[PDB]
Amino acid sequence: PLELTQSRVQKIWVPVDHRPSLPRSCGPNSPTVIVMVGLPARGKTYISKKLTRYLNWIGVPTKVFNVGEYRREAVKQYSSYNFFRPDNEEAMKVRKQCALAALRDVKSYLAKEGGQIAVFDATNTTRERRHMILHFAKENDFKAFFIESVCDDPTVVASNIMEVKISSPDYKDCNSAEAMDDFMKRISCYEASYQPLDPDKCDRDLSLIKVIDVGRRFLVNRVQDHIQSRIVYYLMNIHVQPRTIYLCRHGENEHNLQGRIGGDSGLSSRGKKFASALSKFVEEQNLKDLRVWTSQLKSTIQTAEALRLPYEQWKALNEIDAGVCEELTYEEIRDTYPEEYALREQDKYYYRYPTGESYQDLVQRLEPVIMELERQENVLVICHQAVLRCLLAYFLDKSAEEMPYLKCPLHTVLKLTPVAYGCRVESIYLNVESVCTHRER
Amino acid sequence: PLELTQSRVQKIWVPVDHRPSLPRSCGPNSPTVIVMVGLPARGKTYISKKLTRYLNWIGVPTKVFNVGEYRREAVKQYSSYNFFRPDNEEAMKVRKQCALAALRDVKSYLAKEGGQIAVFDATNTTRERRHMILHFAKENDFKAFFIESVCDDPTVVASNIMEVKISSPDYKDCNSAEAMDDFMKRISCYEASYQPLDPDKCDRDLSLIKVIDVGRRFLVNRVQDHIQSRIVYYLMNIHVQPRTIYLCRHGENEHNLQGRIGGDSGLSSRGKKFASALSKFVEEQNLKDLRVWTSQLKSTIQTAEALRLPYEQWKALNEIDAGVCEELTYEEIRDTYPEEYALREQDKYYYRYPTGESYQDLVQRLEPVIMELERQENVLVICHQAVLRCLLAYFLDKSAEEMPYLKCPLHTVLKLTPVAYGCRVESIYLNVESVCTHRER
Ligand SMILES: Cc1noc(C)c1Cn1cc(C#N)c2cc(Oc3ccc(NC(=O)[C@@H]4CCCN4)cc3)ccc21
Ligand SMILES: Cc1noc(C)c1Cn1cc(C#N)c2cc(Oc3ccc(NC(=O)[C@@H]4CCCN4)cc3)ccc21
Ligand SMILES: O=P(O)(O)OC[C@H]1O[C@](O)(CO)[C@@H](O)[C@@H]1O
Numbered sequence: 049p050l051e052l053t054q055s056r057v058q059k060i061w062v063p064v065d066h067r068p069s070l071p072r073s074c075g076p077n078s079p080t081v082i083v084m085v086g087l088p089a090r091g092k093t094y095i096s097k098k099l100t101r102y103l104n105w106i107g108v109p110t111k112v113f114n115v116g117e118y119r120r121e122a123v124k125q126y127s128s129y130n131f132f133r134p135d136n137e138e139a140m141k142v143r144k145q146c147a148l149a150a151l152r153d154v155k156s157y158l159a160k161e162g163g164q165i166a167v168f169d170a171t172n173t174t175r176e177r178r179h180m181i182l183h184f185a186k187e188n189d190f191k192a193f194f195i196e197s198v199c200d201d202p203t204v205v206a207s208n209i210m211e212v213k214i215s216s217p218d219y220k221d222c223n224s225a226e227a228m229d230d231f232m233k234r235i236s237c238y239e240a241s242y243q244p245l246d247p248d249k250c251d252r253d254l255s256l257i258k259v260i261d262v263g264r265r266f267l268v269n270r271v272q273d274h275i276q277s278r279i280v281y282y283l284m285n286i287h288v289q290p291r292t293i294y295l296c297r298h299g300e301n302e303h304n305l306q307g308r309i310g311g312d313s314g315l316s317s318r319g320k321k322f323a324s325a326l327s328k329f330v331e332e333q334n335l336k337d338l339r340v341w342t343s344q345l346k347s348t349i350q351t352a353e354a355l356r357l358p359y360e361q362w363k364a365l366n367e368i369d370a371g372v373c374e375e376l377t378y379e380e381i382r383d384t385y386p387e388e389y390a391l392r393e394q395d396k397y398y399y400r401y402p403t404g405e406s407y408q409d410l411v412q413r414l415e416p417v418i419m420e421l422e423r424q425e426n427v428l429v430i431c432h433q434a435v436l437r438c439l440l441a442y443f444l445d446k447s448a449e450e451m452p453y454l455k456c457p458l459h460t461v462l463k464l465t466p467v468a469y470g471c472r473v474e475s476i477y478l479n480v481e482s483v484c485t486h487r488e489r
Numbered sequence: 490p491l492e493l494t495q496s497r498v499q500k501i502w503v504p505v506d507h508r509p510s511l512p513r514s515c516g517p518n519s520p521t522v523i524v525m526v527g528l529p530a531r532g533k534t535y536i537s538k539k540l541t542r543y544l545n546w547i548g549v550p551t552k553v554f555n556v557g558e559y560r561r562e563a564v565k566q567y568s569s570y571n572f573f574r575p576d577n578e579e580a581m582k583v584r585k586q587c588a589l590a591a592l593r594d595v596k597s598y599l600a601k602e603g604g605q606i607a608v609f610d611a612t613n614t615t616r617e618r619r620h621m622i623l624h625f626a627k628e629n630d631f632k633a634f635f636i637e638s639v640c641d642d643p644t645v646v647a648s649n650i651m652e653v654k655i656s657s658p659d660y661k662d663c664n665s666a667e668a669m670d671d672f673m674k675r676i677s678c679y680e681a682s683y684q685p686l687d688p689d690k691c692d693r694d695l696s697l698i699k700v701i702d703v704g705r706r707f708l709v710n711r712v713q714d715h716i717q718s719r720i721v722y723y724l725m726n727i728h729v730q731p732r733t734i735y736l737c738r739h740g741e742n743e744h745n746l747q748g749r750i751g752g753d754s755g756l757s758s759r760g761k762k763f764a765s766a767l768s769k770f771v772e773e774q775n776l777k778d779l780r781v782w783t784s785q786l787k788s789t790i791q792t793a794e795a796l797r798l799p800y801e802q803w804k805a806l807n808e809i810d811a812g813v814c815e816e817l818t819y820e821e822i823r824d825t826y827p828e829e830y831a832l833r834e835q836d837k838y839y840y841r842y843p844t845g846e847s848y849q850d851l852v853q854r855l856e857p858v859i860m861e862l863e864r865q866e867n868v869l870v871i872c873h874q875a876v877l878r879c880l881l882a883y884f885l886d887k888s889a890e891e892m893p894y895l896k897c898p899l900h901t902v903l904k905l906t907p908v909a910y911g912c913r914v915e916s917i918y919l920n921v922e923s924v925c926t927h928r929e930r
């Protein structure tokens with residue numbers, strides 16, 4: 049009675065499955081349609097992309113369905129704002145068809161592809177369009193959560209057009225002045241029929257968040273579940289202030305020299321040289337304020353000590369726990385635990401070390417780190433190879449499959465600069481020799 | 490260069506501190522005053538107490554300063570609503586003095602006692618009172634965060650009076666009808682001068698949350714930091730729906746029989762008997778829906794398997810990691826690691842096992858569990874001794890010092906019923922023998 053077996057890869061205790069003569073599968077909670085609401089140049093695509101990047105990283109399969117991309121596919125070349133005119137009978141039919149084709153793909157993603165969240169990235173400015181999306185959600189048993197971005201500041205609108213609209217594939221053959229003028233006219237096409245969300249009377253029963261004046265104020269109505277609560281918390285932690293994220297590993301340690309994994313060894317002579325090189329690098333960056341974060345492991349703390357700056361130790365930044373394989377070389381792992389070695393090589397993200405962790409466990413541990421990185425400005429994170437790959441996968445939108453193989457060499461700073469599309473990444477090698485700890489698939 | 494030492498209790502790497510001939514101390518971010526806003530019977534004291542319980546548990550020293558308690562101290566016996574009349578010159582002076590005496594204690598708590606958050610629990614219904622609190626915060630370099638509870642539903646108001654107001658020390662000599670009538674008149678004394686928070690025009694620069702219609706809607710304005718963001722997320726996860734939380738340990742395991750700590754051993758014959766007894770108990774509770782949560786350790790999963798109910802495994806529910814002391818008996822710990830054994834006995838909450846955890850680390854890991862327990866209704870958590878003590882300390886408002894010594898015997902269910910003041914706790918022993926794993930200080 050109560051016979052369990054431990055799964056080889058993830059190390060999960062499951063009931064011993066003595067399937068009957070004819071094994072039956074039972075193939076396969078409710079998916080969510082996130083509805084973006086607002087006039088053009090209100091950061092809807094920015095919100096869509098950032099939220100999708102975060103949700104995928106935490107393990108919630110999410111996809112953006114941008115109606116404009118369906119339009120660029122249906123209509124070969126973009127000419128002008130005249131396409132967006134409310135009196136343009138033909139283009140209005142085309143635009144509706146594009147929205148319906150995107151919703152068709154939303155249904156296929158959530159009901160047939162194992163997707164959990166579909167972000168419907170369009171203006172959805174009219175009650176009519178939103179009633180149609182709600183009907184689509186109710187008939188398919190999907191939850192609907194609305195995210196509206198409201199802003200009347202002309203400086204914010206003009207800045208968004210200059211930063212990411214003029215560079216749109218629609219304005220390829222246009223100069224900055226033509227594109228800006230056309231886009232202002234394009235926004236005006238939407239202003240007459242725009243009906244903002246009204247949680248007070250009309251939209252009282254809808255689950256929604258109103259992001260007002262680029263996150264200065266929020267109106268939150270009827271948060272139904274955990275994922276909606278998490279989105280609201282995320283939106284309240286992110287910001288659009290300029291800043292830099294520097295990510296690096298501790299300087300080379302004694303275990304690195306011996307080819308040993310885990311442990312709590314100190315910096316080697318080269319590691320100490322990197323720590324000095326890092327201080328000079330940090331100084332040369334001339335940052336008004338800089339937060340320094342380390343793990344609770346000696347090698348990252350010794351590296352931070354060389355900076356002569358205040359730092360904070362996070363247990364969440366500690367390297368992946370190798371369980372029984374801690375302090376062993378990869379050769380000793382292959383010889384003592386050959387089954388374990390091969391299992392990891394085959395499934396590096398989900399593989400859990402015996403009495404240890406997986407990259408999947410790392411993500412769960414690092415989520416508060418990500419949330420705090422979002423709220424901060426200039427931050428230097430001194431961590432470890434697996435931790436760094438996980439954080440980098442979040443910033444660079446890398447999949448779970450790619451994550452355990454990201455190149456994070458020793459004595460190299462990864463400088464992350466948030467641009468309008470995601471992160472610009474610059475690599476800075478601090479000219480101090482070390483061993484190589486990267487292992488390809 | 491870069492010489493560090495590992496602190497004996499917490500195992501934190503610190504710079505070797507070779508203090509000079511004359512050692513200097515440097516004794517000791519900005520504290521926060523949380524301002525409750527709203528008419529009486531709006532759940533301000535309920536919010537104050539629950540939020541304080543959560544903030545203290547996560548390690549943020551928090552205290553409630555209820556102006557009514559300062560009034561009950563200054564004014565010996567309460568007679569009627571006549572004390573709260575706006576034309577009561579004398580009582581208005583007394584009430585102001587009480588609020589100023591509470592603020593004096595707020596200053597002493599935040600600036601002199603190492604308190605981080607002071608919850609100022611009063612009506613604070615007038616702009617004048619709030620301007621005075623803001624002046625007090627600005628002059629003392631304290632942050633101000635407002636939490637307003639707005640509700641016009643007479644059913645909600647009447648229910649609150651019947652549940653927790655009539656039982657107030659003010660209404661000791663009154664019967665339910667007299668107390669209800671007096672309290673309605675008391676609320677009416679505040680209605681004329683009540684100026685709700687206006688984040689649109691007047692309170693635009695204030696950091697605030699408006700909880701509308703018992704959490705149906707929220708107005709969030711200017712969230713400045715991490716703690717305010719966390720409070721907002723907490724308020725959006727909690728609910729006032731009736732439910733039951735059942736907490737228990739896995740049935741007795743093989744390591745329990747050998748007096749061994751940690752490990753991933755299976756249920757003993759008695760443990761299997763408890764698992765059956767637990768199924769019968771659960772069935773007899775006749776709960777419409779019940780969520781079952783386990784750790785990823787075998788003994789909790791085997792216990793859940795006996796229920797024949799769907800369950801979810803949480804790595805966050807895994808027992809405290811004993812590091813190098815894993816799978817050892819307490820006698821073997823005392824003989825192999827006597828220094829470690831004595832250090833733990835002296836500082837059980839902060840003590841970290843070598844390459845292992847502390848109760849302090851458990852709290853950090855269990856925070857997402859608490860957040861999900863809040864969002865859920867009927868939940869059964871099958872876990873481990875140290876995990877159970879931590880969760881119980883949250884629900885029962887126990888300090889960090891008390892937490893490692895809470896009695897959590899094997900084969901015993903802790904039934905938690907949320908009442909208006911906190912949790913009512915019922916213990917249910919399922920009449921199956923086991924070893925005792927409790928060790929007093
Ligand atoms: C790109 C880009 N960089 O600067 C600007 C301006 C843009 C383009 N943009 C224009 C927007 C508009 N309207 C907008 C809204 C956004 O949605 C937001 C959602 C949440 C928050 N949240 C916060 O700012 C939190 C809340 C309080 C503390 N910090 C801010 C914006 C995000 C980006 C937005
Ligand atoms: C005791 C007690 N039990 O039922 C009632 C009614 C009471 C007394 N009471 C009266 C209130 C009023 N007005 C009130 C507000 C509260 O503040 C709240 C703060 C946040 C939330 N949040 C939620 O409900 C979240 C948001 C959406 C999902 N669930 C609710 C109430 C908490 C308790 C309150
Ligand atoms: O996932 P991988 O490739 O083993 O890399 C993570 C490893 O890198 C190290 O930080 C050093 O090689 C080890 O501590 C850790 O086991």
Ligand SMILES: O=P(O)(O)OC[C@H]1O[C@](O)(CO)[C@@H](O)[C@@H]1O
Pocket residue numbers: 749750751752808809811873874875893926928
């Ligand atoms: O903090 P204490 O008193 O050692 O209790 C926690 C211990 O209880 C156990 O669950 C069983 O005694 C061990 O796994 C764990 O080390």
